[PDB]
Each structure stands twice: as C-alpha cells, then as structure tokens.
Ligand binder design. Structure first.
Ligand code: 3HB
Ligand code: 3HB
Ligand code: MG
Ligand code: ZN
Ligand code: ZN
Ligand code: ZN
Ligand code: ZN
Lengths: 503, 494
C-alpha cells in the first residue's frame, strides 16, 4: 500500500516568478513564468499572468489551501529522467574505490579503458548473479536506498535501471520509500567470453534469466503509486545468447514493454563479438527483432554504416554518457563520432549518467559535457543548445523509457515533477539564460528543490523526509558486511576507513 | 602574517612529483611556505619556529577539507564591459534561434580581425572609474574561484585599472596592454597596417615602467600580441627584442581556428607559428593560446623551441571552437612532453572557471585517447597551477606548495556526500564540484576568501559598482539605448 511510504494529497501549488524551462515540444522557456500544480499533475504553465488566470478557476476550498512558492530568485526545470543507470554502490571498496592510494600516479589502463579488456568485462558481468545472491535483503535495501537518494538529490525524479549489482525488489522498495519514480530491471547475463574458448560459453539457461524478469514484472504489475515500472535489459551483447535475445523480443512484444541493452560500447567489442558469436552486437539484436522503437541502446558508438542504418530504420534510441567516458577510458564520443552523427540524422539520443561504485557525474554534469563536447567536435555552438541538453536529460530520455506519457516535460496533464535551482549568485548575474549559467558553473549539488507528483522531497538541498545521516550510516554498515563477507576484503582494511568517514 | 599551520586535510602540492599527502599539513611563515608533507615532518618545522612566532601560530584544522595550490589562470581576458552585447544580457531567454558566428564554424576571420582591431578605441572610450569598477568585479570572480595568479592575454579594459584592481583585491596579476597593428579586410588581398609597431611597443613599455617599482611582489607584466592575424612582422620582431631586453615572458593566440591558416597565407604569406618563429618568438618565453591548428613543421618548431601551450577545453564548444578534437594536436604535443597548461579564456559574463576547465581536460583528453591515465586528476591540477606558472615565468614564486614558494593556497570542504569513501578528494572535486566550492583562498599567507565569502571584499558593493559602470559604458560607448539596459538592471537579484 502507498500509505506505508507517504500520506496526504498535495492540493494546489503555484510556483511563480522564476525562469521556467518546460522541455515541451517547442523547448518553451518562460521568463517570469509560473507552474500551477493540483495534486500530482501540472494544470498550467506559462507566463505568470496567464497562470494566475488558471488559479482563478479554483474552488473556495482548493484556493484556501493553495501553496504559493516565490521562485523569483530561481530557475524551474522538469525533473531529470536518468534512463541509463546502474546500482553499483555495493562495490565501493573494490571498483575504482575506497582502497586506492590517495596518489593517482601509478594508475593503469584497465577494464573499459584502452579499447576494452573484453574477457575481463565479460567475466565480471557474468559474476553479478552470484554476488546479488550473496547480498542479504538488509544489505540490498540499505545500499539501494542511499545510492538512489544520491540520484534524487541531484534532481533525478525518474530513474531507469539498465542492470544493477543489487536485488530488484530492494531497489523497488527504495524507490517507494524515497518518493521517486523507477523503471526496475533484473540482471541478464547468459554467456561469457573466456580466453581459452573458440565460442561463447553458455553460463545459465535463457529461460532462467527470462523467468527472473517475469517475476519482477509480476511483483510491480499491481503497484498503485504510478511511480514503479519495469523494463527488461540484457547486460551487454557479449553476454547474450541468441536464445536470450529471441526470448527478450517475445517478452517485450507480449507485455508491451521497452527494452534496453549495451551495444557498440568499446573499440574492441566488434572483434570479440565476431570471434565468440560470429556477428557484431547491433546485427545480432536486429536478427532477434530487438532493433525497433522499444530499444534504448547504451553508448552505441562503435557501429558500422550498416548498423547505423539498422538503428535509423528501426527508430531506436541511444542513451549517451559523455560526462563519464574519460575517467573510464571509454572513447564512445570522439573516436567514431557516431552518436552525434545519428542524432543529426534524426535518431532520438538522450543523456544519462551510467554509474559506478562511488558518486560520479550526475545529470547536470552530463548536460554540461554534451553542450561542451558535441559542439566542440562540430565547431558549432548550436548543435547541442543548452535547451537541447535539458531535453536530452528530460523529455527525450522519457520517450526512450516509454514514460513520456507522464514525465519529462512541464505541460498540462503531465506529472508535477519539477526542480528549483537558485539563480541569485554571481554565476547567474545579468544572464537572461540561467540554464546556460547552470551548465557553465553549477551542478548536481546546486539542485535546491525536487518535487515528484507535487510532493517536495528535497528543499534547500536537503531531504524533507530523508534522514540523510541515517541513510548514509545504514549504507556504510551494509557495505561493511557485503565487502568483508561476499568480496572477502579483510575487516582490518575496511573498519578504520569507515571510522574516518566525516560524520 | 606570522605563522599558520593548516593540518589534517588531504594536501595536493603540485610539486615536481605531483605529491599528495593524506592527513598532511602546510606550515607558512609570513608570505612563504616553510614546510609541507606528513603531519610529523611539519610539526618538526613548528618546533623550529621563533618562540614568539610559535606562541602566535594560527592553527587551522583542515581534517574536513582538501588543500590545493592557488590556481594560476595564465590565459584570461577582462571582457565584462561587453556584458550587454557579447553573448550577453540582451539575448532572448530562448536559445532556439542561436546561429554559428564569431569563432564558430571554423572562424569568421574578417569579423574576428576587425573586432580585435577595435579594442583600442573602446578602451579609450571607457572612463578610468568605469575601468576600475568593471576590472575589480571581473577579477574578484576569478579570485572567488581560487585564482590567486591571473594573466592578462589582452583585455577590453585599461591596464592600470586592472593593476589597481589586483592591488586592492590582494591577488597576483601579470598585466598586459592591447596590441593590434594589422587588420584582414574583405576588400583587400593583403593585411592593412592600422598602427605603428613602435607605438604599440611603447604602450607596453609605459606599463612596464608603471609596475617596475611595485613593492608587493604581486604585480608583473607580460607583453602579448592580440592574435597573429593582427600582427605585422615589425610588431613580432619588436616584441622579440623587448622580451630579450627586459627578460620577460611573451604571449599570443595562434593556430586557434580551422580558417586561420588560409587567411594567414592569403594576407601575410605565411601561417602563424612560422611567422612567430621567423621573428624569434617560438622559444621558452612563448605562451601560445589554443595552438591546435599546427602542421607537422609548426609542431616541431614548438617542441624545438620548448614553447608553451595554454588550452581552454572548458569553453571551446560554447564558442563553436574545435581546438581539441578536430586536430588532436594539443594532447599529442603534451604526450610528447611540451608544457601544456589549462586556462579559462574569457568572455563578458561568467563562464567556466579553472575548476571547470580541470574537469573538462580530465574527461576530454582521456576520452579522446581511450586512456583514463593520460590526464590524471593530479595532472589537471598541475596544468592549472605549477605548469601554468612555468609558462607565465612565475614558477619562481607560485604554482606549487613547496618550501620557499609563496603561501598561495585553497581550501575546499570535503564533508559532503560527493566525497564519501573517496581516498582521492580531488577526483570527487572534478566529478561533482567547481568554482563555487572553493571555500578559502590565501595569497602570500593572507586570507582573502573564507567560507566562500570575501574577507576584505564586499561582494555586493563590488557588484553594484560594476553594474553602475557597465550601465554608463554600455549606454555611452556601445550606444545601447537606456530603454534596453535599465529593465535588465532593475531585475537584478540584489
Ligand atoms: O555502461 C555499461 O554497463 C557498459 C557495458 C559495456 C561496455 C561499456 O563500455 C559500458
Ligand atoms: O582566445 C582568444 O582571444 C582567441 C583569439 C583568436 C581565435 C580564437 O579562437 C580565440
Ligand atoms: Mg522544512
Ligand atoms: Zn551502462
Ligand atoms: Zn501544449
Ligand atoms: Zn584568449
Ligand atoms: Zn589511441
């Protein structure tokens, strides 16, 4: 039941006097604009005077309880839709993480760097099911809630799981407790690329993987909040049998779902796919019937001309993460230039954070990265306008997630999912485009207020219902158990680091 | 300033080994660093102080902070006088009708050349009071973001106004003068000489004379050429003679744009780095802004001369510049061991600061090479501190936390969610922090910023004087109607 998490109706709210970015079809921006919300929905958005006319249509009772929020020193955005994310905070001690020396001077190219260590990546992904099984229900819920809180704190109101090292129902429960929206998934890996083998090794039955997703779908079918959906994913096309691909196509058609995977992510992927599967990623997905309007492809940069045409013909979707490629040693923007090229050719392309095991670039940081990096590559300050970067992190992401019915833009009849950012400091002075100043000089921590379905979850940069110190301390205790027991890191290395945390 | 001990934080030195000290310390005495390293080494230096100096020691527990060297932003322009007209305050809030212009699309070489040659007239039109108010606010914004040493590479402001602003603010400043003696006009097949080289050089020599006597150690000067398009051979040779005679650094912009080389061949008969080399300017004194559109011979001239490149990857995309990826030359020359630093460049409203530029280099150089080790976070810091200081010829006194160097340092708080469990707070800073997260700024042992607020600076007062000055200059010199300016000023969130 929804009342376990939150109680009460939100009534009418008028948020007025700020610059309002709608991310509607026309990318509408309203200086001295306003948003009127009633309960969970936007009723009116536009110039303040026009929206005051909508306020005049409210009855004596709704008017008497109207909450007026003076946003005159603020910018209003739609809530961010981060459709390509992974819960990986259980790996905080080992994944580019807490045990590294403070000096970075001895760092090496590994994992996704240097074109990608395809055997290591494939083997690591196939080990997720065993580690998820090893995680306790208590550990999963504590780690999920803190990890997803960090997304919400940065203005993510709708979050999409594209394959997590956590228990699916733990992440669903965390989303319910936090008040945010969540597209849940399950871990899907049924093949590994092993150095001593001439084809992929099947590591589990496709039907097992599919049944796991069907169990999640069953669990959240009934959900009455409107905040929980699900979307099946394949971890990575290296770890995907033809039986899993065909099974996913059947499942998505039968249940009318979106679909997500990672493909064309790495320079070294194509040769490994040919060696172990006989065919590259997009062509394997296309053979299974998965290159269509339902597909959100993560990264999707290492595509040849034929694979680019398959994506365009299918009206598929790419989620791109340009804020985080460099620190991973990925080259999914500039080495091929394919994602900006497919966007110019009319493919839907959104911006996402991807994830790792400690806080990294959020949606705000990713919007800045796209604005800088796409425009520099083309010598064109108009290729990604700031309002395009916002659309890519809101409406366009919602379209790829098949949630644009309800979220991603401030328009009448959509969910009242909004951010407020303060614009009264030196960064914003004299700029009629506060979103541009935000991309120059602000980020996740400058999100002031986060509203989901008309409910304030963050205000003044602080959780309203979230107990921030308590969520952190439960996450750290859970991480201690999982790290010492499942990852076999000695307590001697873990406990003094947790003791030195600044509380 | 007496003695200050800053102890318990993670200390990034940007010394020659890029040393990082977890739970490290810095001891300063008066204007200088005396000890930096592990707490035990630094406590030995505390016990070596004059007893009266130790009795008055200012102890700062930085255990919830990160300590950095002060940022050295060696390629900057004061352009805040153009806030109403230059990608500025009069634009519509919607960006949908924006066009490729100015430096975008390979560069409008005629417009760029003509615009640069108009700077002298607009500087002359600016009052001394307007210049001082605009400079002090503009330079405050750099200081607020952790810039302790700022380098002028050609400003739309009065040089002595910017020197006075630096003196008032307490920061370090390498002052320059505007130098443009040629224009590339569409109705001509050769450059047009607009001023005499000896007069342009005399303007710089007058500034050098004005700051020669400065007793603070905080004011230096460096001659620049605006842009090689606007540079005669006589100006270039005269600059080489001047910097040899006075033992100065030299700066210009060269190889900045796709369309530059063809315009340089058409109007001057030779490309920029080759023209600088002929004049004797491609040597260890040169800081070249952008310097990406270089052929193999020009790359070899830069390496042979041990010249320096200042790169601004935080701001190329919004300008429509392509000085990172279109040629890849600057990362390649850096891998080859050329000194390459990071700078903010300019514009007329706040844009990417040094912190933002460090993040940009870390993301963008590493993505281009599929190598998370090409620019480590500590490299991005060195590029914005020690290496920048070396290019500015100020590494004698600034750019790193080492005994004998100036006590110029930053404190950044690390006690929030962004930093949790990271043994590398600089990495969390590059992921999720920026200019506004600079908490404390110390120059020569003096605290100028603390808790993100000016100590002697009245930020609201500097702002209000800048806005008044901008109103006068915009209405009078830029001829923008009061009807367009006053409503924008009326809307300011005071
Ligand atoms: O975002 C990912 O999970 C991913 C998966 C495979 C390759 C890669 O570079 C990234
Ligand atoms: O940084 C500059 O002043 C500059 C000058 C010329 C070309 C360009 O792209 C930039
Ligand atoms: Mg409250
Ligand atoms: Zn991913
Ligand atoms: Zn409409
Ligand atoms: Zn410049
Ligand atoms: Zn390479």
């Amino acid at each position: 039941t929804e009342n376990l998490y939150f109680q009460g109706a939100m009534g009418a709210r008028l948020i007025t006097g700020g610059t309002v970015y709608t991310a509607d079809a026309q990318e509408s921006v309203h200086a001295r604009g306003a948003v009127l919300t009633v309960d969970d929905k936007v009723v009116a958005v536009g110039p303040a005077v026009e929206v005051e006319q909508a306020v005049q249509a409210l009855d004596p009772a709704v008017r008497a309880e109207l909450r007026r929020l003076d946003a005159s020193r603020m910018m209003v955005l739609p809530g961010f839709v981060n459709a390509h994310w992974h819960e990986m905070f259980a790996m905080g001690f080992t994944m580019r993480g807490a045990l590294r020396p403070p000096s970075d001077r001895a760092d090496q190219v590994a994992f996704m760097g240097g074109g990608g260590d395809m055997h290591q990546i494939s083997a690591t992904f196939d080990r997720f099911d065993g580690l998820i099984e090893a995680m306790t229900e208590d550990e999963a819920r504590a780690i999920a809630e803190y990890s997803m809180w960090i997304q919400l704190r940065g203005g993510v109101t709708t979050l999409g799981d594209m394959g997590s090292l956590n228990r699916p129902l733990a992440m669903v429960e965390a989303a319910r407790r936090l008040g945010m929206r969540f597209s849940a998934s399950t871990w899907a890996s049924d093949a590994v690329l092993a150095p001593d083998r001439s084809r992929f090794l099947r590591t589990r039955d496709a039907d097992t993987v599919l049944a796991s997703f069907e169990a999640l779908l069953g669990a959240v079918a009934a959900d009455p909040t409107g905040r929980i959906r699900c979307r099946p994913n394949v971890s990575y096309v290296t770890n995907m049998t033809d039986e899993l691909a065909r099974g996913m196509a059947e499942l998505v058609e039968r249940h009318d779902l979106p679909f997500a995977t990672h493909v064309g992510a790495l320079r070294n992927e194509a040769d490994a796919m040919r060696a172990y599967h006989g065919e590259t990623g997009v062509r394997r997905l296309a053979e299974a019937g998965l290159v269509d309007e339902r597909l959100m492809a993560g990264h999707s940069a290492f595509l040849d001309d034929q694979e680019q045409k398959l994506m365009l013909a299918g009206r598929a979707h790419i989620s791109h993460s340009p804020g985080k490629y460099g620190p991973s040693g990925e080259s999914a923007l500039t080495e091929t230039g394919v994602v900006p090229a497919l966007r110019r050719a009319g493919l839907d392309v959104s911006l996402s954070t991807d994830a790792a095991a400690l806080p990294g670039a959020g949606i705000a940081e990713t919007m800045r990265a796209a604005w800088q990096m796409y425009n520099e590559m083309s010598a064109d300050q108009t290729e990604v306008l700031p309002t395009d970067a916002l659309a890519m992190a809101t409406r366009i992401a919602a379209k790829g997630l098949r949630w644009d019915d309800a979220v991603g833009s401030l328009e009448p009849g959509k969910q009242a999912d909004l951010l407020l950012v303060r614009t009264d400091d030196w960064r914003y002075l004299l700029n009629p485009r506060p979103l541009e100043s935000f991309l120059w000089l602000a980020g996740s921590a400058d999100v002031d207020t986060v509203i989901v379905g008309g409910r304030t979850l963050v205000e003044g940069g602080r959780g309203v219902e979230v107990d921030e110190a308590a969520l952190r301390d439960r996450y750290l205790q859970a991480l201690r158990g999982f790290t010492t027991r499942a990852l076999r890191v000695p307590a001697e290395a873990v406990d003094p680091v947790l003791a030195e945390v600044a509380r």
